[PDB]
Amino acid sequence: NTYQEFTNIDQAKAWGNAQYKKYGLSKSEKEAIVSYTKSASEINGKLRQNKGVINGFPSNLIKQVELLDKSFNKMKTPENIMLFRGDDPAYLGTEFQNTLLNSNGTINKTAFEKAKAKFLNKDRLEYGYISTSLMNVSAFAGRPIITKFKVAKGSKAGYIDPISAFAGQLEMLLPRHSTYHIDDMRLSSDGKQIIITATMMGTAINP
């Protein structure tokens, strides 16, 4: 029914750190996660390019992917929670790359209508892992698309921030090959961003 939305950075940090302490990640799992924060766009890129098939990857990358997948057996959220992600125009498709944004920096309204027609009330499968934050952090202030994921209690989700190679993102990671349903899409008050609300469902990878 209701999803916890953190409104205070220290509260979010406190809750996240308490979750992390309980996971009991293996040494190999922690290594795989640290590496993921340094090289996510590459890993996620290869997963998208190959539709989740890792057979042709280098041996070290197969091992890293298997360790990440396995880590989510220890990383579940204990409550209904709201997660946040910032994205650039290519997230909506090649066609939006050079058309979503006006010269002035606002969302083009015709491009917006094409995006809702394409995505609103539809399912979407993501082959890569999904990096998110416990809040709408300053790092995505400049990003034209904000997604809010409703993640249900018991779902695979881990607070990896304490071992991230990068600071200040309140980072919660979700499994690869996950499906979410886009419930709503609207413009922000100042018209510079698309706010998407989505309900997270399952992943097809359960090692």
Short mmCIF file of N, CA and C in Angstrom, two decimals, residues 69-194:
data_model
loop_
_atom_site.label_atom_id
_atom_site.label_comp_id
_atom_site.label_asym_id
_atom_site.label_seq_id
_atom_site.Cartn_x
_atom_site.Cartn_y
_atom_site.Cartn_z
N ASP A 69 24.80 -11.37 -8.77
CA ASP A 69 23.50 -12.03 -8.75
C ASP A 69 23.30 -12.77 -7.45
N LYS A 70 24.33 -13.50 -7.04
CA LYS A 70 24.30 -14.25 -5.78
C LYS A 70 24.17 -13.34 -4.55
N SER A 71 24.73 -12.13 -4.61
CA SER A 71 24.70 -11.21 -3.47
C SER A 71 23.27 -10.83 -3.07
N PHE A 72 22.35 -10.80 -4.04
CA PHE A 72 20.95 -10.47 -3.76
C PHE A 72 20.15 -11.54 -2.99
N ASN A 73 20.73 -12.71 -2.77
CA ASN A 73 20.19 -13.68 -1.81
C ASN A 73 20.32 -13.20 -0.36
N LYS A 74 21.31 -12.34 -0.10
CA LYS A 74 21.47 -11.70 1.21
C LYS A 74 20.90 -10.27 1.31
N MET A 75 20.55 -9.65 0.18
CA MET A 75 20.17 -8.23 0.16
C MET A 75 18.71 -8.07 -0.23
N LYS A 76 17.86 -7.92 0.77
CA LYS A 76 16.43 -7.67 0.55
C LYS A 76 16.05 -6.47 1.38
N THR A 77 15.05 -5.72 0.93
CA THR A 77 14.53 -4.58 1.69
C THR A 77 13.48 -5.09 2.68
N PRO A 78 13.52 -4.62 3.92
CA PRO A 78 12.60 -5.10 4.96
C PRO A 78 11.24 -4.39 4.96
N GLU A 79 11.06 -3.41 4.07
CA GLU A 79 9.81 -2.68 3.96
C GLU A 79 9.59 -2.16 2.55
N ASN A 80 8.34 -1.79 2.27
CA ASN A 80 7.99 -1.03 1.08
C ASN A 80 8.81 0.28 1.07
N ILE A 81 9.54 0.52 -0.01
CA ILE A 81 10.45 1.66 -0.13
C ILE A 81 10.41 2.31 -1.52
N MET A 82 10.63 3.62 -1.55
CA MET A 82 10.69 4.38 -2.78
C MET A 82 12.15 4.64 -3.13
N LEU A 83 12.54 4.32 -4.36
CA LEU A 83 13.90 4.54 -4.85
C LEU A 83 13.91 5.52 -6.03
N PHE A 84 15.05 6.18 -6.23
CA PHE A 84 15.15 7.30 -7.18
C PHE A 84 16.30 7.10 -8.14
N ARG A 85 16.05 7.46 -9.39
CA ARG A 85 17.05 7.35 -10.45
C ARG A 85 16.98 8.52 -11.42
N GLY A 86 18.13 9.07 -11.80
CA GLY A 86 18.19 10.12 -12.81
C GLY A 86 18.70 9.58 -14.14
N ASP A 87 18.12 10.02 -15.26
CA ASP A 87 18.49 9.52 -16.59
C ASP A 87 18.57 10.63 -17.65
N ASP A 88 19.40 10.40 -18.66
CA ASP A 88 19.53 11.25 -19.83
C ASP A 88 18.53 10.81 -20.90
N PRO A 89 18.34 11.62 -21.96
CA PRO A 89 17.32 11.33 -22.98
C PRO A 89 17.37 9.97 -23.67
N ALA A 90 18.54 9.37 -23.86
CA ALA A 90 18.69 8.10 -24.60
C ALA A 90 18.03 6.90 -23.89
N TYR A 91 17.72 7.09 -22.61
CA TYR A 91 16.97 6.13 -21.81
C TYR A 91 15.59 5.86 -22.42
N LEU A 92 14.99 6.87 -23.04
CA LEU A 92 13.70 6.71 -23.70
C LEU A 92 13.80 6.09 -25.11
N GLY A 93 15.01 6.03 -25.66
CA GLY A 93 15.25 5.49 -27.00
C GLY A 93 16.13 6.40 -27.85
N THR A 94 16.73 5.84 -28.90
CA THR A 94 17.59 6.62 -29.82
C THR A 94 16.89 7.89 -30.34
N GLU A 95 15.60 7.79 -30.57
CA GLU A 95 14.84 8.89 -31.16
C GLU A 95 14.77 10.15 -30.27
N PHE A 96 14.87 9.97 -28.95
CA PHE A 96 14.80 11.08 -28.01
C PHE A 96 16.13 11.78 -27.74
N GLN A 97 17.24 11.17 -28.14
CA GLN A 97 18.59 11.69 -27.87
C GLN A 97 18.77 13.18 -28.20
N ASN A 98 18.34 13.57 -29.40
CA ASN A 98 18.47 14.95 -29.86
C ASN A 98 17.13 15.70 -29.99
N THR A 99 16.04 15.14 -29.44
CA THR A 99 14.71 15.75 -29.59
C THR A 99 13.96 16.05 -28.29
N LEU A 100 14.38 15.45 -27.17
CA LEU A 100 13.63 15.57 -25.93
C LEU A 100 13.68 16.98 -25.35
N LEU A 101 14.84 17.61 -25.47
CA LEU A 101 15.12 18.89 -24.85
C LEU A 101 15.10 20.04 -25.86
N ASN A 102 14.37 21.09 -25.51
CA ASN A 102 14.44 22.37 -26.23
C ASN A 102 15.79 23.06 -26.01
N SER A 103 16.07 24.08 -26.83
CA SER A 103 17.30 24.87 -26.74
C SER A 103 17.44 25.52 -25.39
N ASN A 104 16.31 25.96 -24.83
CA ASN A 104 16.28 26.66 -23.55
C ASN A 104 16.48 25.74 -22.34
N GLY A 105 16.26 24.44 -22.51
CA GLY A 105 16.48 23.47 -21.44
C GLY A 105 15.23 22.82 -20.89
N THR A 106 14.07 23.17 -21.44
CA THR A 106 12.81 22.56 -21.03
C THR A 106 12.57 21.30 -21.83
N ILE A 107 11.70 20.44 -21.31
CA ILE A 107 11.25 19.25 -22.02
C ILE A 107 10.37 19.74 -23.16
N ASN A 108 10.71 19.35 -24.38
CA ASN A 108 9.84 19.55 -25.53
C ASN A 108 8.54 18.76 -25.33
N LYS A 109 7.41 19.45 -25.48
CA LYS A 109 6.11 18.90 -25.11
C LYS A 109 5.62 17.85 -26.11
N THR A 110 5.97 18.01 -27.38
CA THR A 110 5.66 16.99 -28.39
C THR A 110 6.47 15.71 -28.15
N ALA A 111 7.77 15.85 -27.87
CA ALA A 111 8.61 14.70 -27.50
C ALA A 111 8.08 13.99 -26.25
N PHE A 112 7.56 14.77 -25.30
CA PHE A 112 6.97 14.23 -24.08
C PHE A 112 5.77 13.36 -24.39
N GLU A 113 4.93 13.82 -25.31
CA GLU A 113 3.71 13.11 -25.69
C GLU A 113 4.06 11.80 -26.38
N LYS A 114 5.12 11.81 -27.18
CA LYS A 114 5.61 10.58 -27.82
C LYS A 114 6.12 9.59 -26.76
N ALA A 115 6.77 10.11 -25.71
CA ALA A 115 7.33 9.28 -24.65
C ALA A 115 6.24 8.59 -23.81
N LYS A 116 5.16 9.31 -23.49
CA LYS A 116 4.02 8.73 -22.77
C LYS A 116 3.30 7.70 -23.61
N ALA A 117 3.18 7.99 -24.90
CA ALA A 117 2.55 7.07 -25.83
C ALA A 117 3.37 5.79 -25.89
N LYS A 118 4.69 5.93 -25.76
CA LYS A 118 5.58 4.79 -25.86
C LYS A 118 5.65 3.95 -24.58
N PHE A 119 5.48 4.57 -23.41
CA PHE A 119 5.84 3.93 -22.13
C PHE A 119 4.72 3.88 -21.09
N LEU A 120 3.77 4.82 -21.14
CA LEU A 120 2.79 4.95 -20.08
C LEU A 120 1.92 3.71 -20.01
N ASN A 121 1.71 3.22 -18.79
CA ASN A 121 0.95 2.01 -18.52
C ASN A 121 1.48 0.77 -19.26
N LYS A 122 2.80 0.69 -19.43
CA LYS A 122 3.47 -0.46 -20.06
C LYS A 122 4.59 -1.02 -19.18
N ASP A 123 4.97 -2.27 -19.46
CA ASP A 123 6.05 -2.94 -18.76
C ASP A 123 7.33 -2.63 -19.50
N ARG A 124 8.44 -2.71 -18.78
CA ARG A 124 9.76 -2.48 -19.36
C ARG A 124 10.75 -3.40 -18.68
N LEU A 125 11.56 -4.09 -19.48
CA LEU A 125 12.56 -5.03 -18.99
C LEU A 125 13.92 -4.36 -19.09
N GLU A 126 14.69 -4.42 -18.01
CA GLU A 126 16.04 -3.87 -17.98
C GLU A 126 17.03 -5.02 -17.81
N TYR A 127 17.90 -5.17 -18.79
CA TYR A 127 18.92 -6.22 -18.81
C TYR A 127 20.08 -5.96 -17.84
N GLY A 128 20.43 -4.69 -17.63
CA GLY A 128 21.48 -4.35 -16.69
C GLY A 128 20.95 -4.34 -15.27
N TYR A 129 21.86 -4.15 -14.32
CA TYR A 129 21.50 -3.83 -12.94
C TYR A 129 20.94 -2.40 -12.90
N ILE A 130 20.13 -2.10 -11.89
CA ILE A 130 19.62 -0.74 -11.73
C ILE A 130 20.18 -0.10 -10.46
N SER A 131 21.06 0.89 -10.64
CA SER A 131 21.58 1.74 -9.56
C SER A 131 20.53 2.79 -9.24
N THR A 132 20.23 2.97 -7.96
CA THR A 132 19.26 3.98 -7.53
C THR A 132 19.79 4.67 -6.28
N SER A 133 19.05 5.66 -5.79
CA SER A 133 19.38 6.35 -4.55
C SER A 133 18.16 6.36 -3.64
N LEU A 134 18.41 6.43 -2.33
CA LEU A 134 17.32 6.54 -1.36
C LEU A 134 16.60 7.88 -1.44
N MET A 135 17.20 8.86 -2.12
CA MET A 135 16.59 10.18 -2.30
C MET A 135 16.88 10.74 -3.68
N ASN A 136 16.20 11.84 -4.01
CA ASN A 136 16.48 12.60 -5.21
C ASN A 136 17.69 13.50 -4.95
N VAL A 137 18.87 12.90 -5.01
CA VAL A 137 20.11 13.58 -4.64
C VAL A 137 20.56 14.57 -5.71
N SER A 138 21.43 15.49 -5.30
CA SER A 138 21.83 16.63 -6.12
C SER A 138 22.51 16.18 -7.41
N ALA A 139 23.17 15.03 -7.37
CA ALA A 139 23.79 14.45 -8.56
C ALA A 139 22.86 14.33 -9.76
N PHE A 140 21.55 14.14 -9.58
CA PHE A 140 20.68 14.16 -10.77
C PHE A 140 19.83 15.43 -10.98
N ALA A 141 20.20 16.52 -10.32
CA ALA A 141 19.57 17.82 -10.56
C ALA A 141 19.56 18.19 -12.05
N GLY A 142 20.67 17.94 -12.73
CA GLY A 142 20.82 18.26 -14.14
C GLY A 142 20.25 17.25 -15.12
N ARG A 143 19.71 16.14 -14.61
CA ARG A 143 19.17 15.08 -15.46
C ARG A 143 17.69 15.31 -15.80
N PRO A 144 17.33 15.22 -17.08
CA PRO A 144 15.95 15.50 -17.52
C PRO A 144 14.87 14.46 -17.15
N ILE A 145 15.24 13.26 -16.73
CA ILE A 145 14.24 12.24 -16.35
C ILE A 145 14.53 11.74 -14.95
N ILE A 146 13.55 11.87 -14.05
CA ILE A 146 13.61 11.29 -12.72
C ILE A 146 12.60 10.16 -12.64
N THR A 147 13.05 8.96 -12.30
CA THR A 147 12.15 7.83 -12.06
C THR A 147 12.05 7.54 -10.57
N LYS A 148 10.83 7.28 -10.10
CA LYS A 148 10.57 6.86 -8.74
C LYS A 148 10.05 5.43 -8.77
N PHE A 149 10.83 4.51 -8.24
CA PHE A 149 10.48 3.10 -8.20
C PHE A 149 9.86 2.75 -6.85
N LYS A 150 8.66 2.18 -6.88
CA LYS A 150 8.03 1.61 -5.70
C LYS A 150 8.51 0.16 -5.58
N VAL A 151 9.32 -0.12 -4.56
CA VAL A 151 9.89 -1.45 -4.36
C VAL A 151 9.24 -2.09 -3.14
N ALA A 152 8.67 -3.28 -3.33
CA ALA A 152 7.88 -3.93 -2.28
C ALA A 152 8.76 -4.62 -1.23
N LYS A 153 8.25 -4.71 0.00
CA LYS A 153 8.92 -5.44 1.08
C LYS A 153 9.30 -6.86 0.62
N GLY A 154 10.44 -7.35 1.10
CA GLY A 154 10.96 -8.64 0.68
C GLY A 154 11.71 -8.68 -0.65
N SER A 155 11.64 -7.61 -1.44
CA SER A 155 12.28 -7.59 -2.76
C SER A 155 13.79 -7.50 -2.68
N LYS A 156 14.45 -8.03 -3.71
CA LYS A 156 15.89 -7.95 -3.84
C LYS A 156 16.30 -6.50 -4.05
N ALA A 157 17.15 -6.01 -3.15
CA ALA A 157 17.59 -4.61 -3.11
C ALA A 157 18.65 -4.48 -2.01
N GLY A 158 19.81 -3.91 -2.31
CA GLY A 158 20.85 -3.76 -1.32
C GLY A 158 21.45 -2.36 -1.22
N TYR A 159 21.64 -1.89 0.01
CA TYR A 159 22.36 -0.64 0.29
C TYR A 159 23.87 -0.88 0.17
N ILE A 160 24.42 -0.61 -1.01
CA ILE A 160 25.83 -0.85 -1.27
C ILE A 160 26.73 0.39 -1.03
N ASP A 161 26.11 1.52 -0.73
CA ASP A 161 26.84 2.77 -0.49
C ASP A 161 28.12 2.65 0.35
N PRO A 162 28.10 1.96 1.49
CA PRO A 162 29.31 1.89 2.33
C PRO A 162 30.54 1.35 1.60
N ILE A 163 30.37 0.49 0.60
CA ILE A 163 31.53 -0.01 -0.16
C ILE A 163 31.66 0.54 -1.57
N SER A 164 30.80 1.47 -1.96
CA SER A 164 30.96 2.17 -3.23
C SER A 164 32.29 2.94 -3.27
N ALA A 165 32.89 2.99 -4.46
CA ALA A 165 34.09 3.80 -4.69
C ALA A 165 33.76 5.29 -4.81
N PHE A 166 32.47 5.65 -4.84
CA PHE A 166 32.03 7.05 -4.98
C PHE A 166 31.12 7.49 -3.83
N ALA A 167 31.21 8.78 -3.47
CA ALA A 167 30.55 9.31 -2.27
C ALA A 167 29.21 10.01 -2.53
N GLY A 168 28.36 10.02 -1.51
CA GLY A 168 27.19 10.89 -1.46
C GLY A 168 25.95 10.49 -2.25
N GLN A 169 25.87 9.27 -2.77
CA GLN A 169 24.73 8.89 -3.63
C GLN A 169 23.64 8.05 -2.94
N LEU A 170 23.82 7.72 -1.66
CA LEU A 170 22.85 6.91 -0.92
C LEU A 170 22.39 5.69 -1.76
N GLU A 171 23.37 4.97 -2.31
CA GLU A 171 23.14 4.04 -3.40
C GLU A 171 22.49 2.73 -2.96
N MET A 172 21.31 2.44 -3.52
CA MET A 172 20.63 1.14 -3.42
C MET A 172 20.64 0.47 -4.79
N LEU A 173 21.16 -0.75 -4.85
CA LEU A 173 21.24 -1.50 -6.12
C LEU A 173 20.11 -2.52 -6.21
N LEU A 174 19.57 -2.69 -7.42
CA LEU A 174 18.56 -3.70 -7.76
C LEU A 174 19.08 -4.70 -8.77
N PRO A 175 18.54 -5.93 -8.75
CA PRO A 175 19.04 -6.99 -9.62
C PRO A 175 18.87 -6.71 -11.10
N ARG A 176 19.72 -7.34 -11.90
CA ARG A 176 19.57 -7.30 -13.34
C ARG A 176 18.38 -8.14 -13.81
N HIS A 177 17.98 -7.88 -15.04
CA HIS A 177 16.85 -8.56 -15.69
C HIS A 177 15.53 -8.33 -14.96
N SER A 178 15.38 -7.14 -14.37
CA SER A 178 14.16 -6.75 -13.65
C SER A 178 13.13 -6.11 -14.58
N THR A 179 11.85 -6.29 -14.23
CA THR A 179 10.74 -5.73 -14.98
C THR A 179 10.01 -4.74 -14.08
N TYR A 180 9.71 -3.56 -14.60
CA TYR A 180 8.89 -2.58 -13.88
C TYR A 180 7.76 -2.05 -14.76
N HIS A 181 6.68 -1.62 -14.13
CA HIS A 181 5.53 -1.13 -14.86
C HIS A 181 5.39 0.37 -14.63
N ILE A 182 5.42 1.15 -15.70
CA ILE A 182 5.32 2.61 -15.58
C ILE A 182 3.88 3.03 -15.33
N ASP A 183 3.59 3.50 -14.11
CA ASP A 183 2.24 3.89 -13.71
C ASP A 183 1.86 5.31 -14.10
N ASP A 184 2.82 6.23 -14.07
CA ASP A 184 2.54 7.64 -14.36
C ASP A 184 3.75 8.38 -14.90
N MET A 185 3.48 9.36 -15.77
CA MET A 185 4.50 10.22 -16.35
C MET A 185 3.96 11.64 -16.46
N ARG A 186 4.64 12.59 -15.82
CA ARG A 186 4.23 14.00 -15.85
C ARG A 186 5.43 14.94 -15.84
N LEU A 187 5.19 16.21 -16.16
CA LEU A 187 6.25 17.20 -16.16
C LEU A 187 6.42 17.76 -14.75
N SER A 188 7.65 18.11 -14.42
CA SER A 188 7.94 18.78 -13.16
C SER A 188 7.35 20.20 -13.21
N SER A 189 7.17 20.78 -12.03
CA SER A 189 6.62 22.14 -11.90
C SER A 189 7.26 23.17 -12.82
N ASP A 190 8.58 23.21 -12.86
CA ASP A 190 9.30 24.15 -13.73
C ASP A 190 9.49 23.68 -15.19
N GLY A 191 8.95 22.51 -15.53
CA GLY A 191 8.99 21.99 -16.89
C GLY A 191 10.33 21.49 -17.42
N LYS A 192 11.33 21.35 -16.56
CA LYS A 192 12.68 20.93 -16.98
C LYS A 192 12.94 19.41 -16.90
N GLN A 193 12.02 18.69 -16.26
CA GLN A 193 12.16 17.24 -16.08
C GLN A 193 10.85 16.47 -16.28
N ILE A 194 10.97 15.21 -16.72
CA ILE A 194 9.89 14.23 -16.70
C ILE A 194 10.00 13.40 -15.43
#
